[PDB]
């Protein structure tokens, strides 16, 4: 009975489907400043 080797390639694109974006993809528009202005 093995660990740490057989769920772990689901972190290879369910932690990096979220996580990841949440750290981009709202706050990240306030320094874009494309149509903001003071």
């Known amino acids: 009975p ?5 769920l772990t390639x689901h ?5 990096l489907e979220l996580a ?3 750290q981009l993809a709202q ?3 306030s320094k874009r400043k ?4 003071i």
């Open 2 to 6: 093995p660990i740490s080797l057989d």
């Open 20 to 22: 990841r974006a949440e």
């Open 34 to 37: 494309l149509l903001e202005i």
């Open 27 to 29: 706050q990240e528009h």
């Open 11 to 15: 972190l290879l694109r369910e932690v």
